[PDB]
Design a binder for this molecule. Structure first.
Ligand SMILES: Nc1ncnc2c1ncn2[C@@H]1O[C@H](COP(=O)(O)OP(=O)(O)OP(=O)(O)O)[C@@H](O)[C@H]1O
Ligand SMILES: Nc1ncnc2c1ncn2[C@@H]1O[C@H](COP(=O)(O)OP(=O)(O)O)[C@@H](O)[C@H]1O
Ligand SMILES: CC(=O)[C@@H](O)[C@H](O)COP(=O)(O)O
Ligand SMILES: CC(=O)[C@@H](O)[C@H](O)COP(=O)(O)O
Ligand SMILES: O=C(CO)[C@@H](O)[C@H](O)CO
Lengths: 492, 490
């Protein structure tokens, strides 16, 4: 008779579930991982059966923790995944994740003929192999057999929900990650379907994130430890949910998350695409569009620098301590952070990192700090593509392990020159999934109400003096990036 | 029993070496003197201080033996500039090659096409180290002292003048003023007129082997020598370091890398570079020193040793770098930390690591520094020898070249044998040799080989040489990409 909501987050490498009480308070969480399938270089698949097994296990463990009813289970999910089902609804492929680069040549050719540009103009999908549309084109050319027998092309969230309810439905924000969803109609682009040789019937139907998918099959009602009145809430993408999950529900705010990798995002009231296709535009509904830049080179690069500049015994705190002994701007040392190639803002998979501007004045602290500043400059570079000459947002709602320290929080404030707002809850995705459930159940109505759950913790205002230093130094960062932009192909 | 003293009048210190009659060094002594840096770019020294050190050293060396000093010969720093007044007293300190006062004057001359003209005429690269540019600067902003200067000379000239009363320079030293005409081997009249300087205000020019006599009696006593002790005019450190490693003709190259570095070769006629990337300094009618002075040698190694790593010894650094593959997984290090002269001639240059990946760990970065220092020297050497036959070997010296590792690396990158020398002190050795020529004890320059012996030889490993041959174009691509970006870091 006490009611609860479970929010699920179906990520690459692991799913996390959070159990929330009817006041929105998290009362427990459980997560379980699965291996990535990387036989060959560029390969990045996972077994949908394993993921679904983790899902049942997580939900069961959560329900074991309480004596009450699960009113709803809502979903946040990785984007861009692709799975083929045959006519018997059986798996024809693994889940081909966003990180699989099998379509990389397909994209390059599309880019040369002006096709990738057209897909971007139609769907808001950047010219990158992560998209289902490019993977489908690759499959159709190089794996004719499976392409022939595929009757459904879906993502992992659709797969999971299908196993639970026998229904095949995707939400708008997830269709937004296929590269097939038309920005203006918010249904599949007919021209692109024709080129794909895919029929609308071979794709899930599109509904709103709050749609209740009912009923769950009795089998799984038992296995999951739930009621026959437990609802499935369709849910949404991790990108969208992570954004509203930090209360960045409109264009006055941006969401900056930086963990191993990073992302800058904002929600606008109409489709808006970039002439240089430097950021994605993923619809959420007719009056909300998610703009953003996924950025590879976040804390993963901080980690590389920590181990390389020092040694594998240097703590993150030790590194930060040393970096802080250099002046703001690192005496003009520039670090381009593109260690793993880069998506936003430069969209060059061959890019590599650089230190430029060294002199005998640059000692360890200058190099350490340049790394941190470069990481943030890169993010500000991506953010600046979004904003352009529009209203600067009045705050950046910030999360992620790279932004743990006050030093980095303040540095972001100083470089972005807007206040940085940290959040009480880092698990923004399950939180916002939980919120969609509350909407479906009639417990909340307007989106803005998520603010009561997604609460702000600390605010960091730009220090005017340092902000000026960084404002003068950013153009030099861009000069060095520009100078080297055409030089990366050489390294390989 | 007769001995010869070879003197090396360097920046910050002078070193004397006493050689016996068979060219064997039997003792040495050195004395330092402060650099005068009141402001940025300034690099002066007090010539009286230097001359004091010279006397002490010579006296100290004489106190080490029972015999005669047959001769005292000179190897000297280049590009120094001292002005004397009508009373012959110092109007200025020795303004060394490192002094930057004339940097603006050079930039302007370079824009007007005059700096190019100076290079065409004299073989002097477009750089403020040159007396000619320092004179132009003085003429326009130190007009007082410019007005009263009756003699413009260098430190070697000052010393010999104090000892002897005679103002004499040798060809190799004249070659470093930026006023000596390549074709005539005398002061360039057109340049003299622009400077508004009369041939009389400059030392006479003589052969490096010319005996200057007599020595003033006051110094014969002070120095501990004889009335027949000969002063040999001597020559520049650059020229003497080259013949002092037995690199006497175009079939050889001299590579020295200590704190800084230099690549040099001697050819039989004037040769200048369309891009002016190397100097051409006459020694005589049929011998011209081509070279690149390279700032970023062991000084950059030392920076990396401390910055990348603690208190790593040089050997630890070497050990770590050797755990990286040849080519450092294609990581490029442009080593221009202190700006650069040869080969890029950009005082605003800075260093870079370009091509970083998570594959690049401490070993790759350490190794890329060493490869980059060497690539930079190979870049400068390549300017020298283009459109010519490669030298048959590189004659190598310097603390940076101490380890077999770096020696072998030089072989692999240059793709020519590296011959290391028994004698690192090439300058005073060649200075001593000059004295032997003047004393009649040697005739042909080629006989310097009897004294400057090879110690070891390193032959290119064809496998690694191939690797580096493929990597050098990438090093140049990155250098080229960034060449125009340095002015922005001010
Ligand atoms: N004190 C610190 N300052 C800056 N960065 C740090 C610090 N400590 C750890 N990191 C970085 O934080 C990163 C991980 O961030 P995070 O904790 O948000 O995990 P994630 O894997 O990116 O996302 P999630 O665990 O929610 O799935 C690493 O890449 C690491 O180098
Ligand atoms: N084992 C080594 N390997 C490479 N470089 C070294 C090594 N040891 C010292 N160095 C470098 O040697 C240089 C000095 O060269 P050296 O010829 O001995 O002195 P100098 O140029 O002042 O006459 C320094 O700049 C230092 O970093
Ligand atoms: C080829 C390789 O190095 C990969 O790690 C790849 O480049 C991924 O980079 P992007 O996600 O930016 O295209
Ligand atoms: C020392 C510093 O100020 C640098 O600018 C350096 O002096 C460059 O001089 P070079 O012209 O010899 O490269
Ligand atoms: O484009 C995106 C979302 O911003 C991808 O990088 C994410 O990894 C999806 O899970």
């Amino acid at each position: 008779s006490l009611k609860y909501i479970i929010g699920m987050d179906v990520g690459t490498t692991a799913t996390k579930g959070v159990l929330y009480d009817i006041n929105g308070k998290a009362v427990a969480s459980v997560s379980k991982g699965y291996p990535l399938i990387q036989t060959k270089v560029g390969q990045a698949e996972e077994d949908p059966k394993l993921i679904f097994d983790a899902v049942q296990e997580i939900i069961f463990d959560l329900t074991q923790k309480i004596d009450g009813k699960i009113a709803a289970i809502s979903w946040s999910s990785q984007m861009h995944s692709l799975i083929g089902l045959g006519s018997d609804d059986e798996l024809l492929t693994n889940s081909i994740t966003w990180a699989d680069n099998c379509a990389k040549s397909i994209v390059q050719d599309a880019k040369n003929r002006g096709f990738a540009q057209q897909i971007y103009r139609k769907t808001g999908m950047p010219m990158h192999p992560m998209a289902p549309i490019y993977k489908l084109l690759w499959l159709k050319n190089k794996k004719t057999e499976v392409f022939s027998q595929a009757q459904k092309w879906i993502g992992i969230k659709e797969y999971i929900i299908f196993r639970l309810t026998g229904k095949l439905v995707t939400d708008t924000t997830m269709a937004a990650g296929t590269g097939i969803l038309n920005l203006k109609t918010l249904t599949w682009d007919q021209e692109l379907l024709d080129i794909l040789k895919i029929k609308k019937e071979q794709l899930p139907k599109i509904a709103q994130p709050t749609k209740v998918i009912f009923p769950i099959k009795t089998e799984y009602v038992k296995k999951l430890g739930i009621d026959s009145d437990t609802k499935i809430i369709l849910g949404a993408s991790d990108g969208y949910l992570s954004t509203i999950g930090v209360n960045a529900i409109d264009s006055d705010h941006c969401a900056l998350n930086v963990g191993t990798s990073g992302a800058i995002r904002t929600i606008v009231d109409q489709p808006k695409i970039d002439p240089s296709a430097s950021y994605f535009c993923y619809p959420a509904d007719k009056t909300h569009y998610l703009l953003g830049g996924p950025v590879n080179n976040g804390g993963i690069v901080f980690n590389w620098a920590r181990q390389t500049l020092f040694d594998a015994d240097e703590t993150p705190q030790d590194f930060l301590d040393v970096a802080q002994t250099a002046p703001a701007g690192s005496r003009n040392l520039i670090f381009l952070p593109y260690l793993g190639g880069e998506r936003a803002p430069i969209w060059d998979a061959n890019a590599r990192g650089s230190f430029v501007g060294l002199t005998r004045m640059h000692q360890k602290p200058e190099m350490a700090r340049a790394v941190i500043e470069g990481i943030i400059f890169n993010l500000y570079d991506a953010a600046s593509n979004l904003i352009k000459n529009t209203k600067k947002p009045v705050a950046i709602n910030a999360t992620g392990g790279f932004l743990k320290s006050d030093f980095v929080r303040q540095l972001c404030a100083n470089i972005f020159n807007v206040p940085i707002v940290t959040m009480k809850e880092q698990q923004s995705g399950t939180l916002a999934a939980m919120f969609l459930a509350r909407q479906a159940l009639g417990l909340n109505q307007d989106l803005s109400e998520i603010g009561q759950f997604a609460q702000a913790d600390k605010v960091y205002f730009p220090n005017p003096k340092e902000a000026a230093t960084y404002q003068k130094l950013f153009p030099l960062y861009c000069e060095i990036r520009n100078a080297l932009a055409a030089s990366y192909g050489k390294f390989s």
